[PDB]
Amino acid sequence: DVSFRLSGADPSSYGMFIKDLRNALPHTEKVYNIPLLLPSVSGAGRYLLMHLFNYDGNTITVAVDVTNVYIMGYLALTTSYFFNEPAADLASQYVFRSARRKITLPYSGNYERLQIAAGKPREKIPIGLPALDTAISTLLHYDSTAAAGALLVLIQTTAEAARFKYIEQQIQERAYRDEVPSSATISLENSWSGLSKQIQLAQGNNGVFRTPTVLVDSKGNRVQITNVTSNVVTSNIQLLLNTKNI
Numbered sequence: 471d472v473s474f475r476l477s478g479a480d481p482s483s484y485g486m487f488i489k490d491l492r493n494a495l496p497h498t499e500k501v502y503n504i505p506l507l508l509p510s511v512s513g514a515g516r517y518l519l520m521h522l523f524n525y526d527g528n529t530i531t532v533a534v535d536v537t538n539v540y541i542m543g544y545l546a547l548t549t550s551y552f553f554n555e556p557a558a559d560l561a562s563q564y565v566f567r568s569a570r571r572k573i574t575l576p577y578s579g580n581y582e583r584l585q586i587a588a589g590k591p592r593e594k595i596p597i598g599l600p601a602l603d604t605a606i607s608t609l610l611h612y613d614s615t616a617a618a619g620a621l622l623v624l625i626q627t628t629a630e631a632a633r634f635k636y637i638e639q640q641i642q643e644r645a646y647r648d649e650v651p652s653s654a655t656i657s658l659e660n661s662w663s664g665l666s667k668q669i670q671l672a673q674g675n676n677g678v679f680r681t682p683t684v685l686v687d688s689k690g691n692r693v694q695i696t697n698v699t700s701n702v703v704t705s706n707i708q709l710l711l712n713t714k715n716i
């Protein structure tokens with residue numbers, strides 16, 4: 471299990487959390503020096519538990535599928551909550567079995583459904599360490615509309631930061647002040663599956679992508695990533711989604 475405390479949190483302690491999160495995900499192989507997540511893991515070993523503590527010291531435990539870094543559900547006091555999707559239902563067979571009750575959220579965990587439930591796109595939801603503290607607080611007490619927004623914050627500040635160093639750094643910049651995600655941040659999130667695939671295909675193709683991946687740079691301009699020498703590959707992406715899961 472991996473842990474993060476918002477009480478006394480700073481950029482360094484957050485960086486240590488994201489390092490721990492990445493380090494927990496199992497892999498046998500690296501592709502261009504980037505850990506390749508496993509095709510599958512059977513049983514309870516599929517799920518990583520993250521213990522998160524808000525500034526007041528209250529906690530949730532979040533279940534993460536170690537093959538795809540997807541959040542499946544979370545435990546808050548004696549109640550578990552899982553996304554309304556088959557992978558989460560399966561997870562609920564293995565984690566938080568001790569919960570007194572299990573609530574299925576009224577949405578799946580994909581960004582599109584969460585944004586609909588929340589009433590707002592990610593572009594307009596501030597992220598940062600204060601926002602993460604707030605998200606943990608929200609998730610302690612069931613409100614499905616508020617939780618959707620909280621879960622968009624939680625997913626970006628854990629999973630997406632684990633996937634991309636750039637996103638980790640963006641959250642570190644927002645240690646004491648929230649700010650809506652940069653356009654480049656959104657682009658990277660949206661491209662993780664595509665990049666993961668092309669980096670794997672590039673082995674066998676001299677490091678050249680079969681199909682370019684289009685991103686937005688931090689300044690605002692659209693760029694094409696065509697091969698493994700790109701900074702996105704050498705110095706940003708930290709985890710690859712297995713092509714078996716794409």
Ligand SMILES: Nc1nc2c(ncn2[C@@H]2O[C@H](COP(=O)(O)O)[C@@H](O)[C@H]2O)c(=O)[nH]1
Nearest residue numbers: 539540541542553579580581625629659660
């Ligand atoms: N269940 C779940 N879906 C997620 C999570 N984080 C991001 N998503 C996103 O929702 C988008 C579409 O995912 P898909 O529904 O195609 O698997 C992707 O960006 C995917 O990564 C998460 O933590 N849990």
Ligand SMILES: *[C@@H]1O[C@H](CO)[C@@H](O)[C@H](O)[C@H]1NC(C)=O
Nearest residue numbers: 678695696697698699700701
């Ligand atoms: C490889 O990527 C680099 C960095 O963007 C670029 O300058 C170069 O043109 C690319 N080469 C090929 C063959 O795609």
